[PDB]
Amino acid sequence: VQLVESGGGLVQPGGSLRLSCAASGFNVSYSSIHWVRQAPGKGLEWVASIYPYYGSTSYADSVKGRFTISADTSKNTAYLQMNSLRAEDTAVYYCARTGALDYWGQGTLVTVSSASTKGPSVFPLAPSSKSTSGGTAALGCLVKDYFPEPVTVSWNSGALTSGVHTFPAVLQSSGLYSLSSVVTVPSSSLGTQTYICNVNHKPSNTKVDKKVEPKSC
Amino acid sequence: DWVEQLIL
Amino acid sequence: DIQMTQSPSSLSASVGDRVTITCRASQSVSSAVAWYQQKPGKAPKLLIYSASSLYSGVPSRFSGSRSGTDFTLTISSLQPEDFATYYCQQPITFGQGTKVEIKRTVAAPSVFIFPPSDSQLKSGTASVVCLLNNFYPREAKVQWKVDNALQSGNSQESVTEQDSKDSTYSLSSTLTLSKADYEKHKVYACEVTHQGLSSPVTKSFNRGEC
Amino acid sequence: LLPHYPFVTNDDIEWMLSICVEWRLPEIAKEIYTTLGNIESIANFSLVKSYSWLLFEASCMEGQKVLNAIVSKDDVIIPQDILVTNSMRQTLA
Amino acid sequence: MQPFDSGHDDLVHDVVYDFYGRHVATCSSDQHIKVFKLDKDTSNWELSDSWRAHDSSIVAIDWASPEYGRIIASASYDKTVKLWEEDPDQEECSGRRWNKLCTLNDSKGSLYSVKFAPAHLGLKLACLGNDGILRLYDALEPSDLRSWTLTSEMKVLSIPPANHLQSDFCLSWCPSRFSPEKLAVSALEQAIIYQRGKDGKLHVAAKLPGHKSLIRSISWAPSIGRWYQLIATGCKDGRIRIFKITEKLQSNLQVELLSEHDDHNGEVWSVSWNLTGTILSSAGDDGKVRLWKATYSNEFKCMSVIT
């Protein structure tokens, strides 16, 4: 049993996207396929459904006239054609079925905007020279001014995970995101161990590795 | 239809 | 369109506690009400259908009930893995969601300040960062001071999700200035106020000193 | 062989049925279904004696006095599926 | 798949699978009937319910077709046969999960066996005891699982001597759906077959000759695919026997002996078949279980020996 969703991504506003949901493990022909979306940090919004039995379709007011739901029983696949896309339509889109909604799509992220993809700059957050003797120090990287989401951060290529916190991005008034990632390490290791942050911004194909060390005077 | 089936 | 109102919108409960989430339909829907659980970053998972039928495989600690137009989701004994947003559902409409967290003892933050790197100033802007590590409860207050002057409107913050083992939060705050404004001032400080702290903690640096 | 199929899903059952159709085994399908039948379940089911009993129950409920009742008199799909005497009587009530 | 305790105090007589093979019914001398469930998640067998059901030792048991509900039947030395139906609205292990639907007291001697008939004949069943009289019962109205009428009575044995602890009787219906109603019966050394006549009465249509002692077990094999019937018997003389019965002193039935096997060297207590009648099982004194498959020539060969 499994729904599969493909065909989202990045799309200019006023633009168009066709989402697919390939089904298996159940009777597509007597099921109903629904599309439910979730905007960043918000709740679930049902937008549309189709009866594969009768071909009947219906739509939430917010997408009516721009979204078309359809279905091909012969390939067990359903579709949502999204025209005249808007910032308001940015969301993870889930396909789900009813024979309640027992079978859910893993979701695909639709981001709608005109801003150019911009790679982040990566700056060190250097460990304080006053770091406590025999105590714990903090260090990090600041991943500033990128668009769209998301960015991923690792430390020492995934080998360092303990004491790591990567914070949610905030949207600056510039319309670009910034996020921070930090880790705590023993103070006595600042002289002796290497700490490298690894940043990936897939939309721009940016990858950066930045060694974080105490500042020299 | 429903009232024809009740009369029957 | 039908509105579904969940109460409360957010709750905190200890492991082993009994938890009740209620959902009230705008108009009278019939027992056609389902409950879901959503972990962050993942698809919702069905818990309950037809108001009180337990979906196959779901742990029996979850149950659903109806009283008129009030629908109840009950968790008889809360487990640490149960933190999520829960949704009722009856156009199909969803409730606004109820966020459930695990309650624990106060934990004071550890506080760290970071000056802007040379490379950042190198581009015209200066970001100063205050880290509050591993604390509880979530309500921490950061107050930036620049040469002891209070700051407003030029900072932003975000908070991690609750730690899966020790149940604490961390918080990051970023103060943003122009390089020029940054260079007009000497003492940069972040003051943290929190329940676990018996008085506020201030971390600071002097610009350009080491 | 078919009666021993380890069906669980709806699809499994539909497969069984599709094979009963494809091979013309109405007595088999009738038996399988009989096994499935054995309040909501009863509503879904709605052999002659059983239908009569269901009718009587419906009448008793009416005398005592929701979506299913309206359908008898998501929703569109149900109406399509529906598209017997017991049912007609309940609708009249 | 490690062994487990039944929960019985006295010796266990019969174990039977439900239709789906996911449930098991056990009956012992401690006058109890236990029902075990095969948990999906943890592939372990776990007690669904136990309960006292008879005033004496319960020897036989059997499940009815699922198309008639969840029904079990029991036979005891207390000369009775009881019928039970599972009530899903009860906690497991509560002892109140199975309600008696009826009792059959017509037998005037202890009972040794009870078998439900093939579903394609309605709720029907048979029983045999000391009285040497086979009895068929029918639940005429499938709605009233209490309306158990007596369909037939046949004298298997004619003169059972009042001084013998050495008694054994076995039953087994012909599972076949596309074959005229008939069933096999073992009584001591004898083993005879009954068939429904045009007159709706049972008649002896044949006998399975060769047994030189007590017949401990017999079972009719599912004849899926075949045009003939096969019934196997485990005798006390230490021999497994497999008979081929074809229908083409007053019979319309032929009787061939296909195989004989003494591999057990001692009495063969249990004889069982596949769901497809593709595999035959046997168990005995040697403390071993043997699985048999049929050759291309229709002979039978031992494909494995468990111990």
* Residue extents of the structural domains in chain E: 12-247+252-307
- Give the separation between CA D84 and CA C21, rounded to whole angstroms: 42
Chain E: touching chains (3 or more CB pairs < 8 Å): D
Going by the DSSP 8-state scheme, the letter that residue E225 receives in this structure is S
- Give the separation between CA E156 and CA E136, rounded to whole angstroms: 13
Q: Using H for helix, E for strand and C for coil, what is the string for A176-209? A: CEEEEEEEEEEHHHCCCCCCEEEEEEHHHCEEEE
- Give the separation between CA C164 and CA C106, rounded to whole angstroms: 16
Pairing of strands E71-76, E58-63: antiparallel
Per DSSP, helices labelled H in A109-199 are none
Residue C171 and residue C158 in contact, taking contact as beta carbons nearer than 8 Å:
yes
User: Order of strands across the sheet with E133-138?
Assistant: E111-116, E124-129, E133-138, E149-155
Residues E105, E109, E112, E116, CA torsion sign:
negative
- Tokens 């049902």 appear where? A46
Among D9, D77, D81, beta carbon nearest to A26 = D9
Going by the DSSP 8-state scheme, the letter that residue C74 receives in this structure is E
Chains B and C: 3 or more CB pairs within 8 Å of each other: no
For residue D59, give the 3-state DSSP assignment: helix
Distance of CA E39 to the CA centre of its chain: 26
Is D66 within 8 Å of chain C by CB? yes
Is A2 within 8 Å of chain D by CB? no
Q: Pseudo-torsion of CA E257, E263, E268, E273, nearest 10°? A: -60
* C113: its two tokens: 């300040």
- Interchain proximity D66–C32, CB inside 8 Å: no
- Interchain proximity D53–E67, CB inside 8 Å: no
Residues C41, C42, C48, C49, CA torsion sign:
positive
Tell which residue, E155, E249, E263, E256, has the closest CA to residue E205. E249
Tell which residue, A180, A167, A71, A175, has the closest CA to residue A124. A180
The neighbour count for residue A75, using CB atoms within 10 Å, is 11
- Give the separation between CA D69 and CA D78, rounded to whole angstroms: 12
- Give the separation between CA E184 and CA D11, rounded to whole angstroms: 39
Chains B and E: 3 or more CB pairs within 8 Å of each other: no
Breaks in chain A listed by the residue before each, with C–N > 2.5 Å: 99
Q: What is the crossing angle of helices D10-23 and D26-37, to 10°?
A: 160
Q: What's phi and psi for E240, nearest 5 deg?
A: -90, 140
- Give the separation between CA C59 and CA A100, rounded to whole angstroms: 18
Pairing of strands A67-72, A77-82: antiparallel
The residue length of chain C stands at 210
Q: What share of chain E is helix, strand, coil (3-state, %, to 5)?
A: 0, 50, 50
Tell which residue, C132, C177, C172, has the closest CA to residue C154. C177
Run of H or E residues at A38: strand A32-38
Q: Pseudo-torsion of CA A203, A204, A205, A206, nearest 10°? A: -120
B4 to chain D nearest CA, in Å? 9
Residue C159 and residue C171 in contact, taking contact as beta carbons nearer than 8 Å:
yes
Distance of CA E91 to the CA centre of its chain: 29
Name residue C49's beta-bridge partners: C53
For residue D85, give the 3-state DSSP assignment: helix
C-alpha Rg value of chain E to the nearest Å: 19
D24 to chain C nearest CA, in Å? 33
- Interchain proximity B6–D73, CB inside 8 Å: no
Name residue C64's beta-bridge partners: C73
For residue A159, give the 3-state DSSP assignment: coil
The one-letter amino acid code at B5 reads: Q
Among D1, D34, D35, beta carbon nearest to E224 = D1
Strand ranges, E, within E89-148: 98-104, 111-116, 124-129, 133-138
Is A32 within 8 Å of chain C by CB? no
- Tokens 């010796």 appear where? E11
Is E95 within 8 Å of chain D by CB? no
- Give the separation between CA D34 and CA E165, rounded to whole angstroms: 44
- Give the separation between CA E23 and CA A134, rounded to whole angstroms: 64
- Give the separation between CA D32 and CA D16, rounded to whole angstroms: 9
The one-letter amino acid code at E226 reads: R
- Give the separation between CA D55 and CA D47, rounded to whole angstroms: 12
Burial (Cβ within 10 Å: 0-12, 13-18, ≥19) of residue D51? middle
Q: What CATH number does the domain located at E12-247+252-307 have?
A: 2.130.10.10
The one-letter amino acid code at C188 reads: Y
Tell which residue, A164, A214, A167, A198, has the closest CA to residue A184. A164
The one-letter amino acid code at E157 reads: L
Name residue E257's beta-bridge partners: E243
Residue A97 and residue A34 in contact, taking contact as beta carbons nearer than 8 Å:
yes
Tell which residue, D91, D84, D88, D85, has the closest CA to residue D70. D91
* E155: its two tokens: 């004298």
**Residues in chain D within 8 Å Cβ distance of C50:** 40
Burial (Cβ within 10 Å: 0-12, 13-18, ≥19) of residue D22? exposed
- Give the separation between CA C15 and CA C21, rounded to whole angstroms: 16
Tell which residue, A96, A48, A52, has the closest CA to residue A74. A52
- Give the separation between CA E67 and CA E123, rounded to whole angstroms: 10
Among A27, A54, A56, beta carbon nearest to D10 = A27
The neighbour count for residue C1, using CB atoms within 10 Å, is 9
- Give the separation between CA E126 and CA E118, rounded to whole angstroms: 11
The residue in chain C having the minimum alpha-carbon distance to the alpha carbon of residue A178 is C174
Chain B: touching chains (3 or more CB pairs < 8 Å): D
The residue in chain A having the minimum alpha-carbon distance to the alpha carbon of residue C116 is A125
Chains E and D: 3 or more CB pairs within 8 Å of each other: yes
Going by the DSSP 8-state scheme, the letter that residue D2 receives in this structure is G
Resolution of this model in Å is 7.4
Residue A78 and residue A95 in contact, taking contact as beta carbons nearer than 8 Å:
yes
Going by the DSSP 8-state scheme, the letter that residue E92 receives in this structure is T
Per DSSP, helices labelled H in D38-83 are 40-45, 48-64, 67-72, 77-82
Residue E293 and residue E273 in contact, taking contact as beta carbons nearer than 8 Å:
no
A16 to chain D nearest CA, in Å? 28
Residue E185 and residue E169 in contact, taking contact as beta carbons nearer than 8 Å:
yes
- Give the separation between CA E289 and CA E50, rounded to whole angstroms: 28
